[PDB]
Amino acid sequence: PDYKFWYTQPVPKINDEFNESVNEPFISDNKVEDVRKDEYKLPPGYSWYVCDVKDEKDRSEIYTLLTDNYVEDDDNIFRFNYSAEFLLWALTSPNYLKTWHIGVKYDASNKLIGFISAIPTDICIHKRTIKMAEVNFLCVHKTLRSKRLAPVLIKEITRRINLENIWQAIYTAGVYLPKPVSDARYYHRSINVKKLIEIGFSSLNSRLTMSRAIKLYRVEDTLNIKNMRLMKKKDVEGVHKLLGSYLEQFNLYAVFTKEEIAHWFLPIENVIYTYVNEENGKIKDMISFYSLPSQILGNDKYSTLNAAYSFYNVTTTATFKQLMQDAILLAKRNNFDVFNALEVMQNKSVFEDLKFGEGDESLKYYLYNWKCASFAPAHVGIVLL
């Protein structure tokens, strides 16, 4: 590929590799006063719109755009169906800016046809903590693809982020762009076997009949960690200590404040599930996963694949395998069809024994305006929604 847009940006070229001693911006000594104050030009008939995600109607417009036009798998069987409540949660983390929730409308219909978002977070990359924007939910309507709208959205959110004296960003994508700092395959653990077979997600054969498949993935409805329970507000301090200490081992992670722990982990039904094990009033283990359904395209019987996505999991009183087995059980108890996880943190070590299967694509991790050594995904300690 030519990367005609991306090679104008402060990112590595596709062949760039850096030693471990390199960990710095491509462009330093940036000045807020020099940042463009004018919005990037859109094609005629289109206008910028500042979305208010706390307004139900604006939020529902983003929801509809994404439901109809957001990420599909490689085979166009599934399309992500983030719920409106999920989008509210994902976009209103501590210190969020409404002006970083950027829509594009088609003037004649007043309809949203494009979106991009960012939230602020402190990111530790190779032991150096940098204030960054986390970019997500970039979407252009299917009818307007390949018209170079996405670089306009990217340049406009870059401009707005730079106005806040922030010069780095983290983002993930499935497409290969210049240039990943890490690449993580995803793995799936079947829960509702029959449904997964009926929609083509899973397969049978003459050895693995339907009944044998169901038996293979059967789970015992008893926790390894008996007192694992839904997180409560009182647990924020202990989760902050447990997770914050755990994450320091990785090459890439968010440095969460207590306010961020409360936001990202306190349970919201059909959005975010966090469970904790409290011993002596101290939090010693945690499980978390978020709800991300995929619409099943064209299916007559099922509209939705109800998937739970591994988020952050820490154990000090059990094995990581026992902890993730409990995560699968808790996902089953909450009526999820499948448990999805990336090969980040310690996850890959449990995939074989817990009967995960390898998926057909991977998620790449990227930094904007940062040069450093890349790393295997076991060194990644951050999950983007």
Ligand X SMILES: C#CCCCCCCCCCCCC(=O)SCCNC(=O)CCNC(=O)[C@H](O)C(C)(C)COP(=O)(O)OP(=O)(O)OC[C@H]1O[C@@H](n2cnc3c(N)ncnc32)[C@H](O)[C@@H]1OP(=O)(O)O
Ligand Y SMILES: Cc1nn(C)c(C)c1CCOc1cc(F)ccc1-c1ccc2c(c1)c(CN(C)C)nn2C
Q: What's the min distance (Å) between Cβ of 196 and ligand Y? A: 10
In this complex, which beta carbon is closest to ligand X, that of residue 251 or of residue 369? 369
Cβ(39)–Cβ(49) under 8 Å?
Answer: no
In this complex, which beta carbon is closest to Cl ion, that of residue 21 or of residue 222? 222
Q: Of 185, 186, 224, 214, nearest to 330 (Cα)?
A: 224
Q: Of 161, 182, 177, 183, nearest to 6 (Cα)?
A: 177
280 binds, among ligand X, ligand Y, Cl ion, none (CB under 5 to 8 A by kind): none
Residue 326: phi and psi, rounded to 5, are -65, -35
Q: What's the min distance (Å) between Cβ of 333 and Cl ion? A: 9
**Prior bond of 179 cis (ω within 30°):** yes
Interaction with ligand X in 124-163: which residues (CB under 6 A)?
133, 135-140, 145-151, 154, 157-158, 161
Cβ(319)–Cβ(351) under 8 Å?
Answer: no
363 binds, among ligand X, Cl ion, ligand Y, none (CB under 5 to 8 A by kind): ligand Y
In this complex, which beta carbon is closest to ligand Y, that of residue 231 or of residue 342? 342
Q: What's the min distance (Å) between Cβ of 170 and ligand X? A: 8
**DSSP label at residue 329:** H
Interaction with ligand X in 154-213: which residues (CB under 6 A)?
154, 157-158, 161, 166-169, 171, 173, 175, 177
Count of Cβ atoms closer than 10 Å to residue 8 Cβ: 10
Contact positions vs ligand Y (CB under 6 A): 71-73, 78-80, 136, 172-174, 186, 294, 307, 309, 340-342, 359, 363, 384-385
Of 218-226, 258-266, 341-349, 361-369, the segment contacting Cl ion by CB under 5 A is 218-226
Q: E strand or H helix at 237, and its extent?
A: helix 236-247
**Beta-bridge partners for 183:** 364
Q: What's the min distance (Å) between Cβ of 216 and ligand X? A: 33
Q: Does 1 bind ligand X (CB under 6 A)?
A: yes
Dihedral angle, C-alpha 115, 363, 347, 229, nearest 10 °: 10
Q: Does 222 bind Cl ion (CB under 5 A)?
A: yes
Which SS3 state, helix, strand or coil, does residue 99 take?
helix
C-alpha angle 278/282/287, rounded to 5°?
50
Q: Of 344, 375, 331, nearest to 179 (Cα)?
A: 375
**DSSP label at residue 72:** B
Of 2-10, 96-104, 224-232, 311-319, the segment contacting ligand X by CB under 6 A is 2-10
SS3 content of the chain, % helix, strand, coil (to 5): 30, 30, 45
Of 147-155, 222-230, 272-280, 359-367, the segment contacting Cl ion by CB under 5 A is 222-230
Q: Does 71 bind ligand X (CB under 6 A)?
A: yes
In this complex, which beta carbon is closest to ligand X, that of residue 154 or of residue 196? 154
370 binds, among Cl ion, ligand X, ligand Y, none (CB under 5 to 8 A by kind): none
Radius of gyration of the chain (CA): 21
Cβ(180)–Cβ(375) under 8 Å?
Answer: no
124 binds, among ligand X, Cl ion, ligand Y, none (CB under 5 to 8 A by kind): none
320 binds, among Cl ion, ligand X, ligand Y, none (CB under 5 to 8 A by kind): none
**Residues found near ligand X in the complex (CB under 6 A):** 1, 3-6, 69-71, 133, 135-140, 145-151, 154, 157-158, 161, 166-169, 171, 173, 175, 177, 368-369
